[PDB]
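User: Last request for today: this protein with calcium ion, please.
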Amino acid sequence: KSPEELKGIFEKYAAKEGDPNQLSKEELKLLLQTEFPSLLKGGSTLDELFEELDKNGDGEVSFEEFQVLVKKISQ
Ligand SMILES: [Ca+2]
Ligand SMILES: [Ca+2]
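Assistant: Here's the final one, the structure of the complex with calcium ion:
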């Protein structure tokens, strides 16, 4: 799924809960569940995965750091 998809995915889901802009750890959950269940051919759990994803801040991800996901979908 191209950059132009994933850009539209991230934004919509980042706005699931109170905040419009970041992906919370518990917000990534729903995202993954709906859109990536078969794509997660790994061992990594949510929290472990989030903790690759979020550079060093610790509360919520945003598209910036989500580009690690955009890489790892080829991984
Ligand atoms: Ca949010
Ligand atoms: Ca962050």
